[PDB]
Design a protein around this ligand. Sequence first.
Ligand SMILES: *[C@@](O)(C(=O)NC1CCCCC1)[C@H](CCCCN)NC(=O)[C@@H]1CCN2CC[C@@](N)(Cc3ccccc3)C(=O)N12
Ligand code: NA
Ligand code: NA
Lengths: 26, 10, 250
Amino acid sequence: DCGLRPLFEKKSLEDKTERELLESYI
Amino acid sequence: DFEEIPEEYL
Amino acid sequence: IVEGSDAEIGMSPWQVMLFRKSPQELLCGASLISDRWVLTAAHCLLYPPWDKNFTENDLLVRIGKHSRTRYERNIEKISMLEKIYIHPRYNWRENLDRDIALMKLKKPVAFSDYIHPVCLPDRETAASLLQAGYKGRVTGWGNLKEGQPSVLQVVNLPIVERPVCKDSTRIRITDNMFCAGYKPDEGKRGDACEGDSGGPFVMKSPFNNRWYQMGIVSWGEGCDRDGKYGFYTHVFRLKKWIQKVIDQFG
Ligand SMILES: *[C@@](O)(C(=O)NC1CCCCC1)[C@H](CCCCN)NC(=O)[C@@H]1CCN2CC[C@@](N)(Cc3ccccc3)C(=O)N12
Ligand code: NA
Ligand code: NA
């Protein structure tokens, strides 16, 4: 169950800056 | 200023 | 952390606090990788130049924290160490090469909304993500400038090419390290700072949506100086050693 956060991914909610990481993986 | 911890931990 | 922001609650459930029994003080950052194992920077335990040599009895591991100093009753779990394992070839004498250690908890910890492990990279996850330009995330309760936050901070930084890394210092860089930070140019800032050591550098896989630990906060010359970068232990490169110990030692 590693790396899946109980308050974000498991509820399909995003943290306020995770998109900047994703948008960089070109 | 670290708030103290419960004795059972030391 | 310099120029970061307060983390949201439950944002880094694997963040651990290395804590000194007396004086009661924060020693370093760390990360939870399973219910009985913690990963940190070897120089957080052993560094002879500063007379540092911690033993299992000297410390405590505090998990599920948000505030740097209150005792978060009903949220945090405070554990004891059973054993400490330091990379047999860690170089404290010259450049902090192989700056990595494992700590095995006295009793397995229970997962909760605030407590959960991070994944460790596989060869192919490392190959697609560890690229110049991609961003990772660092967290910690360290100094705000080259002073102390009340809560965990966060910053996102880009990985930098090897050449740039080497031309920025006089220290000899090895394959066991990577450097991250913006260019003086890029006009965005941020870095790790004293007290952040032993914490995690993480990335979020675009393939399976999971968070992986790519690096450990190791060293830097100042905090957030222009033309300087932060250096991190290369977790994948040391993975064989990690396996080998979790295997052999419970
Ligand atoms: C860590 O946060 C750290 O280990 N903090 C300690 C616990 C709290 C009290 C102070 C010590 C730190 C983070 C640096 C971030 C900078 N942007 N790292 C270090 O202090 C490593 C440990 C050895 N030490 C020697 C001086 C260094 N600045 C530079 C250096 C010189 C020679 C070899 C390697 C690195 C350094 O960062 N540093
Ligand atoms: Na150089
Ligand atoms: Na810099």
